């Protein structure tokens, strides 16, 4: 009966489908790779907002991604705290295969709305944000 | 530019405010206590859907809640796997203090929508669900 409760229901159903179709790439991981491909060499701090995570969660996720050869990083010579992120060629393949999968999972729920309903749903979400 | 991406943004902003105002009670924990109070003695399996969690996440969260004296449980004499959940008196106090806080956090975002926009936002979320 609460709005944010039903939002948790919808988000859990989406996560459940995402788990089945993309078992090795969660939605936060997918958003990070997508934001790196949208801006190769993006600075790690700007990647926090671009992928909707946190400084600590992004650092742990990027470390695991380069452990698996999916991303590579370079450092600011004047400030080693500043890092820039690229996808490797293997990371570009992992992302390219996952995009039509993730799109179909998003479509299972969004496709239940008309174009006007989709545009309106995004206007309301934008209105509630800070 | 994606709908579920902006939903993650809105949900992260809500979690950030919830973290500050209720540092010892997350939104999933709050939903569990709220569902137990709505149906004292609710069976643990039905509590999974009522609070929007999973069997394993609920089991871990309920164990910690009774470690802190916030919930108590009873077992089916014929099937010890079946358990029923109550709030303790101390759990009733923790929940009662948190409800006006959680309501104000929900209101910070929902209050940016009119009554008609709120009703419509919940109709669209219900339409996208399974």
């Amino acid at each position: 009966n609460k709005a944010f409760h039903q939002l948790r229901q919808l988000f859990q159903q989406h996560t459940a489908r995402w788990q089945h179709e993309l078992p090795d790439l969660t939605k936060p991981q997918y958003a990070v790779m997508r934001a790196i491909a949208d801006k190769p060499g993006i600075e790690q701090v700007a990647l926090i907002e671009a992928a909707v995570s946190t400084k600590a969660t992004l650092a742990e996720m990027l470390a695991r991604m380069e452990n698996r050869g999916l991303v590579r990083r370079e450092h600011d010579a004047a400030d080693k705290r500043r890092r820039f992120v690229w996808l490797t060629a293997e990371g570009e393949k992992v992302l390219a295969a996952a995009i039509p999968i993730g799109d179909s999972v998003d479509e299972e729920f969004l496709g239940r709305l008309s174009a006007e309903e989709q545009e309106l749903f995004m206007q309301l979400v934008r209105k509630m944000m800070n």
Side-chain angles (χ1 to χ4, degrees), chain A residues 3-63 65-67 69-79 81-118 120-125 127-130:
Chain A
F4 280 95
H5 175 92
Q6 288 189 177
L7 262 187
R8 289 181 62 243
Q9 292 181 306
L10 169 65
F11 214 77
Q12 178 181 60
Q13 297 181 355
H14 185 274
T15 295
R17 297 283 307 115
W18 197 284
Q19 256 158 13
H20 180 260
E21 305 299 329
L22 288 166
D24 307 308
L25 195 67
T26 71
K27 321 196 292 196
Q29 295 173 335
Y30 170 79
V32 159
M33 300 189 69
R34 200 89 200 260
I36 297 165
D38 288 348
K39 194 168 180 135
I42 179 177
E43 210 265 312
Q44 193 163 314
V45 165
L47 186 57
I48 295 168
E49 195 208 303
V52 196
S53 74
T54 66
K55 177 168 172 93
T57 305
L58 180 63
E60 181 227 289
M61 174 192 307
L62 288 180
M65 271 173 190
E66 63 177 2
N67 280 354
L70 300 186
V71 317
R72 65 171 187 86
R73 284 186 287 186
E74 292 179 13
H75 298 74
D76 191 323
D79 191 358
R81 298 169 299 191
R82 306 191 28 176
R83 298 169 101 160
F84 315 98
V85 201
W86 289 262
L87 293 185
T88 65
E90 185 67 30
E92 300 271 10
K93 288 175 199 93
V94 169
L95 180 63
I99 288 176
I101 315 294
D103 284 351
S104 68
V105 179
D106 292 348
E107 154 70 23
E108 289 179 16
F109 305 89
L110 291 151
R112 305 186 162 108
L113 303 186
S114 66
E116 286 82 357
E117 286 172 325
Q118 291 186 19
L120 171 43
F121 175 80
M122 278 170 54
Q123 287 173 351
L124 297 167
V125 170
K127 195 165 183 177
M128 283 184 287
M129 272 163 39
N130 303 323

